[PDB]
Structure 1
Amino acid sequence: GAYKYLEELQRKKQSDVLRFLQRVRVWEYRQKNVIHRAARPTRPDKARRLGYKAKQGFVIYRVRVRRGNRKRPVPKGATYGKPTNQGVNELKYQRSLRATAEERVGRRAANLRVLNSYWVNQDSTYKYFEVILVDPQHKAIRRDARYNWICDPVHKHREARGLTATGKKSRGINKGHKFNNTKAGRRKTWKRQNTLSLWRYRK
């Protein structure tokens, strides 16, 4: 197999061959549009392990996202409140750029469902992701029971609701004493324990 070599080689990012390929491909992607259909994955091993299958109804979209912090769009940087808010160019946007890219791509392609995404390249100004999408109207995927679950309607805009891996991470959904405030839903636990339960026969 060659996917193993591809994995171990893509791990060596600061070697000469990979930084050359990076320097070329970033220029190519920057000359192309911000969102554009990719004929095939730049990284077949990554796509393969994330759930891509080279058959009809599986789609790859390359997407570009601006880098840096979040700026609040108040006029003239004034917030009109207490001074303790913070400097305005220092806000961080709890959702990741990968999620932003996934959601923009899913908005362009609304008939598709966003399965996953992965980093390909980056610059000072831009980050570059390849997004894997699925067509649930295609019969090859309506059949083929390994992927017929994406066709049910509870998987609409997974990326917008935070069900992809980056979404689960940004929500902080894992098991442990560390993820106690956000394990079943931050707001769910808050609503659960800031709630006065009163029984018929009062305790």
Structure 2
Amino acid sequence: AYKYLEELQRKKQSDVLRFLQRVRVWEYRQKNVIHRAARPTRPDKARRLGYKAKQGFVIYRVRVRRGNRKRPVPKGATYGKPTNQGVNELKYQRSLRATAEERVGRRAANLRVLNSYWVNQDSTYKYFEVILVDPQHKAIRRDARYNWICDPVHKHREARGLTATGKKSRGINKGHKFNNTKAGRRK
């Protein structure tokens, strides 16, 4: 079964994928910033990423906000070149869904987060859904086929960068790049 689902949600828009994404988003949208877990929306390629299984269960949902970069201030200003001068249209190196992963963390790091999956997109957001495993918990480290997440440092890192999209938005390359730095370098 898992396979059908996977390669099924692989065809977006498309009759079902759409007439579904619509009801859902029309739902989801309305339910508090982040609105922690229910029972795992799309379980398909969720396993690809250590699915639901953690810890016993726990996968929360969050609506990040869409768009570009809110350059604060009102001004400039600061000379401008090399703007500086520029404001309205800086673009966020962050990683839209990344932000999601972080806030989710905050909204409760009684757990630690294994990875985050997309789900839908308005013109006023981007509906991402994150996973967990409650290390400070049960089988999590007991039936620990996975105590990885449990050990000392590998935790809360749901935003020290060492996550996945950050790992990606940085340097998981190898060759043709200056992407393990740090470095800087070189003095």
Same-fold status (TM-score > 0.5): yes
Q: Which residue of 2 aligns with 1:72?
A: 71
Q: Distance in 2 between matches of 1:164 and 1:120?
A: 19
User: What root-mean-square deviation, in Å, do the aligned CA atoms of Structure 1 and Structure 2 show?
Assistant: 2.7
Q: Distance in 2 between matches of 1:7 and 1:69?
A: 31
Q: 1:56 Cα shift?
A: 4.5
83 and 116 in structure 1: CA distance in 2 versus 1, 3 angstrom threshold: closer
Q: 1:92 Cα shift?
A: 1.4
Q: Which residue of 2 aligns with 1:62?
A: 61
Q: Which residue of 2 aligns with 1:15?
A: 14
Using structure 1 for the length normalisation, give the TM-score. Answer: 0.82
36 and 155 in structure 1: CA distance in 2 versus 1, 3 angstrom threshold: same
Name which of structure 1's ranges 176-185 and 7-16 shifts more when overlaid on structure 2: 176-185
Q: 1:44 Cα shift?
A: 0.6
CA contact (8 A) 1:113 1:135 kept: yes
Identity %: 100
Q: 1:38 Cα shift?
A: 2.3
Q: 1:185 Cα shift?
A: 8.4
Name which of structure 1's ranges 48-57 and 85-94 shifts more when overlaid on structure 2: 48-57
Unaligned runs of 5+ in 1: 188-202
Aligned residues: 187
> Which secondary structure state, in structure 2, belongs to the residue aligned with residue 64 of structure 1?
strand
Select the structure that is richer in helix. 1
Q: Distance in 2 between matches of 1:32 and 1:185?
A: 44
Q: 1:3 Cα shift?
A: 1.2
164 and 52 in structure 1: CA distance in 2 versus 1, 3 angstrom threshold: same
CA contact (8 A) 2:77 2:84 kept: no
86 and 169 in structure 1: CA distance in 2 versus 1, 3 angstrom threshold: farther
CA contact (8 A) 2:70 2:88 kept: yes
Structure of higher CA gyration radius: 1
125 and 175 in structure 1: CA distance in 2 versus 1, 3 angstrom threshold: same
CA contact (8 A) 1:173 1:179 kept: no
Q: 1:6 Cα shift?
A: 0.7
CA contact (8 A) 1:173 1:182 kept: no
Q: Distance in 2 between matches of 1:68 and 1:132?
A: 24
181 and 53 in structure 1: CA distance in 2 versus 1, 3 angstrom threshold: closer
Unaligned runs of 5+ in 2: none
Using structure 2 for the length normalisation, give the TM-score. Answer: 0.88
> Which secondary structure state, in structure 2, belongs to the residue aligned with residue 5 of structure 1?
helix
Q: 1:57 Cα shift?
A: 3.7
CA contact (8 A) 2:55 2:138 kept: no
Select the structure that is richer in strand. 1
53 and 41 in structure 1: CA distance in 2 versus 1, 3 angstrom threshold: closer
Q: 1:36 Cα shift?
A: 0.7
Name which of structure 1's ranges 9-18 and 50-59 shifts more when overlaid on structure 2: 50-59
> Which secondary structure state, in structure 1, belongs to the residue aligned with residue 113 of structure 2?
strand
Q: 1:101 Cα shift?
A: 0.4
Name which of structure 1's ranges 10-19 and 139-148 shifts more when overlaid on structure 2: 139-148
> Which secondary structure state, in structure 2, belongs to the residue aligned with residue 154 of structure 1?
coil
